[PDB]
Design an enzyme around this catalytic site. Structure first.
Site, PDB file in Angstrom:
ATOM      1  N   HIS A  38       0.851   3.840  -8.602  1.00 51.19           N
ATOM      2  CA  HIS A  38       0.962   4.857  -7.561  1.00 51.19           C
ATOM      3  C   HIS A  38       2.321   4.843  -6.873  1.00 51.19           C
ATOM      4  CE1 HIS A  38       0.671   1.975  -4.294  1.00 51.19           C
ATOM      5  NE2 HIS A  38      -0.496   1.529  -4.723  1.00 51.19           N
ATOM      6  N   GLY A  94       3.266  -0.472   2.219  1.00 55.07           N
ATOM      7  CA  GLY A  94       4.306  -1.070   1.413  1.00 55.07           C
ATOM      8  C   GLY A  94       3.974  -2.431   0.843  1.00 55.07           C
ATOM      9  N   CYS A 132       1.677  -3.010  -1.446  1.00 58.09           N
ATOM     10  CA  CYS A 132       1.239  -2.922  -2.829  1.00 58.09           C
ATOM     11  C   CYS A 132       2.285  -3.541  -3.746  1.00 58.09           C
ATOM     12  CB  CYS A 132       0.975  -1.468  -3.224  1.00 58.09           C
ATOM     13  SG  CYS A 132      -0.405  -0.695  -2.349  1.00 58.09           S
TER      14      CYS A 132
HETATM   15  C1  LIG Z   1       0.010   0.018  -1.100  1.00 60.39           C
HETATM   16  C2  LIG Z   1       1.261   0.267  -0.738  1.00 60.39           C
HETATM   17  C3  LIG Z   1      -0.981   0.532  -0.077  1.00 60.39           C
HETATM   18  C4  LIG Z   1      -1.594  -0.662   0.661  1.00 60.39           C
HETATM   19  C5  LIG Z   1      -2.517  -0.210   1.779  1.00 60.39           C
HETATM   20  C6  LIG Z   1      -1.819   0.516   2.923  1.00 60.39           C
HETATM   21  C7  LIG Z   1      -2.410  -0.067   4.197  1.00 60.39           C
HETATM   22  N1  LIG Z   1      -3.069  -1.288   3.764  1.00 60.39           N
HETATM   23  C8  LIG Z   1      -3.152  -1.413   2.447  1.00 60.39           C
HETATM   24  O1  LIG Z   1      -3.667  -2.350   1.875  1.00 60.39           O
HETATM   25  N2  LIG Z   1      -2.024   1.247  -0.793  1.00 60.39           N
HETATM   26  C9  LIG Z   1      -2.325   2.533  -0.591  1.00 60.39           C
HETATM   27  O2  LIG Z   1      -1.743   3.214   0.240  1.00 60.39           O
HETATM   28  C10 LIG Z   1      -3.446   3.101  -1.422  1.00 60.39           C
HETATM   29  C11 LIG Z   1      -2.980   4.067  -2.516  1.00 60.39           C
HETATM   30  C12 LIG Z   1      -3.379   5.462  -2.112  1.00 60.39           C
HETATM   31  C13 LIG Z   1      -4.221   5.342  -0.858  1.00 60.39           C
HETATM   32  N3  LIG Z   1      -4.341   3.903  -0.598  1.00 60.39           N
HETATM   33  C14 LIG Z   1      -5.167   3.324   0.251  1.00 60.39           C
HETATM   34  O3  LIG Z   1      -5.132   2.160   0.331  1.00 60.39           O
HETATM   35  C15 LIG Z   1      -6.130   4.110   1.135  1.00 60.39           C
HETATM   36  N4  LIG Z   1      -7.456   3.631   0.856  1.00 60.39           N
HETATM   37  C16 LIG Z   1      -8.337   4.368   0.177  1.00 60.39           C
HETATM   38  O4  LIG Z   1      -8.100   5.486  -0.225  1.00 60.39           O
HETATM   39  C17 LIG Z   1      -9.711   3.737  -0.067  1.00 60.39           C
HETATM   40  F1  LIG Z   1     -10.318   4.357  -1.110  1.00 60.39           F
HETATM   41  F2  LIG Z   1      -9.588   2.424  -0.373  1.00 60.39           F
HETATM   42  F3  LIG Z   1     -10.458   3.858   1.060  1.00 60.39           F
HETATM   43  C18 LIG Z   1      -5.764   3.973   2.621  1.00 60.39           C
HETATM   44  C19 LIG Z   1      -6.099   2.581   3.217  1.00 60.39           C
HETATM   45  C20 LIG Z   1      -4.254   4.228   2.746  1.00 60.39           C
HETATM   46  C21 LIG Z   1      -6.525   5.066   3.399  1.00 60.39           C
HETATM   47  C22 LIG Z   1      -3.534   5.013  -3.537  1.00 60.39           C
HETATM   48  C23 LIG Z   1      -4.974   4.711  -3.989  1.00 60.39           C
HETATM   49  C24 LIG Z   1      -2.578   5.597  -4.598  1.00 60.39           C
END
Ligand SMILES: *C(C)[C@H](C[C@@H]1CCNC1=O)NC(=O)[C@@H]1[C@@H]2[C@H](CN1C(=O)[C@@H](NC(=O)C(F)(F)F)C(C)(C)C)C2(C)C
Ligand SMILES: *C(C)[C@H](C[C@@H]1CCNC1=O)NC(=O)[C@@H]1[C@@H]2[C@H](CN1C(=O)[C@@H](NC(=O)C(F)(F)F)C(C)(C)C)C2(C)C
Lengths: 305, 305
Positions: free
Chosen positions: B41, B143, B145
């Site tokens: 992603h 950030g 991830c």
């Molecule tokens: C990686 C950079 C990031 C880590 C998370 C942000 C805040 N804490 C974390 O662990 N991951 C993401 O942003 C992922 C990515 C996009 C949405 N996402 C999420 O983690 C979202 N969660 C969900 O959608 C779910 F299904 F787990 F509830 C959210 C926490 C930002 C809302 C991707 C799946 C591409």
């Protein structure tokens, strides 16, 4: 989100850990530039440690009596000196992995990462708070001495602790990197006990701010309080008095959450008088005091190194 | 003595962390030999993540669209491929700090150290257990991830987790280093919830053995039990069934302490039915299930790396 007890990355310190052997006693040493720092009881036999005369024991040792090993490489000792309870061994090779570093004496209530080591090899890493009684709740076995505690600021490693001994209650005591013990302890195998500990109030508040940031807000009440009033209630529960300096240090968290420090003090006052009623805060059934205001900000804002 | 949640030394992994930027999205990557692994992603915009077609997004990207940076040095991407939910970026430079490593898929109940990173820089390290619902109780921000979980066996780093997302309850989900998610989760910003979790029974027993080793023995009762009986009582409290494999894995701790596994099961049976009566075990008011039998042995015997 999520809040975890989080240690600093240990890589910069792992590159400085060596094994120091004097006779039959082996422990860890910190190799910075061309100097190896280690506890001075490396020069003691099992018998000497009951009442050692370190200055005398060090007479009978020459440079060659100290076997320093970085990995498989032996570092030739070309000098030795004693500073308080630490031994400084000059070696003919400067550590090429020496990070930017400082020697600091942390205050009670501050935290640091401990790199537990045995035979000069890192075993694990965990966070510890310098308790008000100048002990740390660590995990140390035989041969762990020389393991160091540290903080990392950007690229600078601030060494603040070297492990020396374990107290009857299973807690641990050590020195700064200048060899000065934290607390009234001495590097002698004799009857010593840690003083009665106290709860680091500012760290509890910081931890409650961490809870609010992470969505755990059930403990927030409608009230405020005064610094004087709170401290009188907190004193009963063996909490350190909260100073204005502590309030100022909590400012960043208070501003981020929009919760005044004294409003959070009122919530803590109620938690101390009424308990948690079987509930948890950040998954903990007890109030945590090993997170400094910096630790909370660092983790909730993502400070890197 | 002392028992602490202890992470592996992160140095070997710190040398493999890089920053991966595709367009405006930046996250972390694992640089092993001449390959950078990162969540796929990274190629998504904030809009794409709601329902991304990763295969389609990857078409429109060439090697030069991926900015890989190890420190200040940019690593030239000379190839890109997608394996499940991970992106593999071939670079023209092999990481000289590549440790001996494996890619492993850990089982629920096993632990690993997480090196939390942002912008390719290590922020901190902490231990996590792969929950039965295939989540981890981590601490991750925007950030984070690409941050990876790992175990260290002597000199071999077994990478087992890469962080991808956070679930509604504040818990976290990710993939193995082959891009296969742990659990039924997908890398899409859509409604997803972690299944109902369960307590890792074998880890609780391991933790009770750790308590006995450290002198905390008040919970040891006079009784024994059968594997069948214990499991029927533990089932009510949402404890995983204890298998004979788990009993066998606890053998080392049972032998060291002289307490049969089923005798410890009787003590846990009483703790589950009668509670702890306001007492603590290893300073904890709750039963801890994030310590594997290995974690206990490693810490109580001083295994190094
Ligand atoms: C990686 C950079 C990031 C880590 C998370 C942000 C805040 N804490 C974390 O662990 N991951 C993401 O942003 C992922 C990515 C996009 C949405 N996402 C999420 O983690 C979202 N969660 C969900 O959608 C779910 F299904 F787990 F509830 C959210 C926490 C930002 C809302 C991707 C799946 C591409
Ligand atoms: C360093 C190698 C070692 C670490 C301890 C061993 C087990 N856990 C530890 O943290 N230190 C020591 O062995 C020191 C040394 C000798 C005795 N000692 C102790 O830690 C002892 N404690 C005490 O004497 C006291 F006062 F704290 F209670 C003991 C735990 C071994 C009994 C020196 C002071 C030279």
């Amino acid at each position: 989100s999520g809040f975890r007890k989080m240690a600093f990355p240990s890589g910069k310190v792992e590159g400085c850990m060596v094994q120091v052997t004097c006779g039959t006693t082996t422990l860890n040493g910190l190799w910075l530039d061309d100097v190896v720092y280690c506890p001075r009881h490396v020069i003691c036999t099992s018998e000497d440690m009951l009442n050692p005369n370190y200055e005398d024991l060090l007479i009978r040792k020459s440079n060659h009596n100290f076997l320093v090993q970085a990995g498989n490489v032996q570092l030739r000792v070309i000098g030795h000196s004693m500073q308080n309870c630490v031994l400084k061994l000059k070696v003919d090779t400067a550590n090429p992995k020496t990070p930017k570093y400082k020697f600091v004496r942390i205050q009670p209530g501050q935290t640091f990462s401990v790199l537990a080591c045995y035979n000069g090899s890192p075993s694990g890493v965990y966070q510890c708070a310098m308790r008000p009684n100048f002990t740390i709740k660590g995990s140390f076995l035989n041969g762990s001495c020389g393991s160091v505690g540290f903080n990392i600021d950007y690229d600078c490693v601030s060494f603040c602790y070297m492990h020396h001994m374990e107290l009857p209650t299973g807690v641990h005591a050590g020195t700064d990197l200048e060899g000065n013990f934290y607390g009234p302890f001495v590097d002698r195998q004799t009857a010593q006990a840690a003083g009665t500990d106290t709860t680091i109030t500012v760290n509890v508040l910081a931890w409650l701010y961490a809870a609010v940031i992470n969505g755990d807000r059930w403990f927030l009440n409608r009230f405020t309080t005064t610094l004087n009033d709170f401290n009188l209630v907190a004193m009963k529960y063996n909490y350190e008095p909260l100073t204005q300096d502590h309030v100022d240090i909590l400012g960043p968290l208070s501003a981020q959450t929009g919760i005044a420090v004294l409003d959070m003090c009122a919530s803590l006052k109620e938690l101390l008088q009424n308990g948690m009623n079987g509930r948890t805060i950040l998954g903990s059934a007890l109030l945590e005091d090993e997170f400094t205001p910096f630790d909370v900000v660092r983790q909730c804002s993502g400070v890197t190194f």
